[PDB]
Design a protein around this ligand. Structure first.
Ligand SMILES: CC1(C)Nc2nc(N)[nH]c(=O)c2N=C1C(=O)NCCN1CC[C@@H](S(=O)(=O)C[C@H]2O[C@@H](n3cnc4c(N)ncnc43)[C@H](O)[C@@H]2O)C[C@@H]1C(=O)O
Ligand SMILES: [Cl-]
Length: 158
């Protein structure tokens, strides 16, 4: 299964957080990285008195079950760094979101895939388009069509 993971951080050195997270993701059992997007600097969505985010997307091939993958991404969020901040609306030391898990839809207490708001977030869609321009979502909608219709501004590189 190709999982697409969104990475974000705006605290505790986002470049260090993202590099450490990518290394850890590549070492998840039964998994390996196929592609990583460019690293982008994006203005915060939500409260404006917080630093800019580093956002990226990574295609990860995995034979893990979705919940098993989530166990590992959550373990990484806990093991990595000296301090974890995960406040609603930010700031965020490190988020590893499962944006898409193959073409599957999951709606459990722990896991909602596709990510529930990704179609409204340019900082998720543009890095994904860089690495999967022909992607079609589980509901049949085309990624390129969403970007055409919504006209999300393109992103600057970190
Ligand atoms: C401040 C804001 C809006 N502004 C930003 N601005 C820019 N420019 N750039 C950004 O990057 C950026 N980020 C921002 C931001 O808020 N980021 C956090 C995004 N995200 C993280 C995961 C979940 S969570 O509530 O933190 C944890 C629980 O979710 C459960 N869970 C369910 N489904 C999941 C899944 N598919 N993957 C992982 N966990 C999942 C899991 O079981 C846990 O209990 C929902 C949360 C959200 O979107 O609300
Ligand atoms: Cl969908």
């Amino acid at each position: 299964t190709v999982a697409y993971i969104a990475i974000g951080s705006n605290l505790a050195s986002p470049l260090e957080q993202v590099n450490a997270a990518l290394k850890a993701l590549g070492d998840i059992p039964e998994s390996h990285i196929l592609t990583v997007s460019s690293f982008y600097r994006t203005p915060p969505l939500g409260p404006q008195d917080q630093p800019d985010y580093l956002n990226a997307a990574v295609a990860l091939e995995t034979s893990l079950a979705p919940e098993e993958l989530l166990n590992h991404t959550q373990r990484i969020e806990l093991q990595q760094g000296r301090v974890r901040k995960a406040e609603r609306w930010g700031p965020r030391t490190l988020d590893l979101d499962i944006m898409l898990f193959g073409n599957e839809v999951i709606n459990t207490e722990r896991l909602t895939v596709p990510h529930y708001d990704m179609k409204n977030r340019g900082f998720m869609l543009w890095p994904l388009f860089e690495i999967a321009p022909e992607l079609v979502f589980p509901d049949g909608e085309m990624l390129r069509q969403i970007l055409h219709t919504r006209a999300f501004d393109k992103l600057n590189k970190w």
